[PDB]
Nucleic acid binder design. Sequence first.
DNA 1: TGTTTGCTCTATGTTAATCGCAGAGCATAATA
DNA 2: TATTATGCTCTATGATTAACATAGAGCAAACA
Lengths: 91, 90, 92, 89
Amino acid sequence: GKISTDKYIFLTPRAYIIVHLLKVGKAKASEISENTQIPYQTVIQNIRWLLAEGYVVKEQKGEEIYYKLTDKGKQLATAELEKIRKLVEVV
Amino acid sequence: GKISTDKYIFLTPRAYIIVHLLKVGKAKASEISENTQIPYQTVIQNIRWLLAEGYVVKEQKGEEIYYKLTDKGKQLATAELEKIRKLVEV
Amino acid sequence: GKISTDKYIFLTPRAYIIVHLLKVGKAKASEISENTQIPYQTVIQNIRWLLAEGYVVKEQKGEEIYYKLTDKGKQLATAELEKIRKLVEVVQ
Amino acid sequence: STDKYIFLTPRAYIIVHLLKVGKAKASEISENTQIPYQTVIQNIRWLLAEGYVVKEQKGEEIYYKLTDKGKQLATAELEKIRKLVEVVQ
DNA sequence: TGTTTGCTCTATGTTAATCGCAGAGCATAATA
DNA sequence: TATTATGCTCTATGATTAACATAGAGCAAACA
């Protein structure tokens, strides 16, 4: 189909998640949602893509689960992030 | 919508496309493609939407069709170009 | 979550998907939906989880996208199928 | 991450147990299948509403059993199963 | 009489899962 | 040579509900 959004013209809802896993290092499904305001349903489906690809792993701390970046994760979250600013500088 | 995929971890084709328009001034259809590495079809319907919203404008400099950013698009470009550095600050 | 539903009283949507991948090898999300009569939206929702948990892997050559079971994938399957063969067994 | 209910549902065991036994207390089915009690009732609450099982209060001893409509569904769903298993080979 | 021990089911909030609609990424066939 | 239509894919996420855990609470026979 076509396009219609004011929320994600430039940044994906994923970027807000990976970034918040840098600022906080490790977070919880619910928690990510709140201090990012990205809908919970969206967060879980994304952290799930991150789990599969290895950018994140979970720490089941009791009745709760915690999602945190990895070597590969912190890597992408950093290097690929540079590409962001390396082209944001030019403007 | 199909916002974030594999090809697009951080930025949408809208990003690479608008930016490239700030860079080149007025690129054509395929031009934005070859540069941004984004598949043509994706590009063309994002431009179809940029026209719709008034961020881009059709231009007839020759037989072919070139695309430039309106000031409205530029205001969007710059404006959200800060939510990129801002959020990234951490 | 919601595991037991009017449509899933005994088997879950996973039970059907995994077994389709078993029988078929590689399959498109659609295909799996079309063969299990499980709504598509339910299908990727669980594929996406099977990817996270490393039971399933994505194979895509540009347009065509497939999904196969990993090795823990075929492991989970035969182990689950066991808890089942055992179930109905004790039921007789 | 419902690694607890991957192929089968809590409903699957609850019913299958009430076939093996016919009569059981809520606390019984729960203990005897490793299913949290609060899940067992909420399920029995549905099983009663859809009329698949029925209550029986002989004093302060409450028991649950399948209706005819229950065993019907029981041995029926167990067929969608029986079907699915063997087709894997 | 009343409190305790103990069993039972009820009230219900948090998270997680079914699965629906409106996207949107992109490839190809169709059309200007 | 480029745009739109067509259509198959996955995504964004919201509505409904289940899984199950915390805190009741109806109410038995057993202490004090």
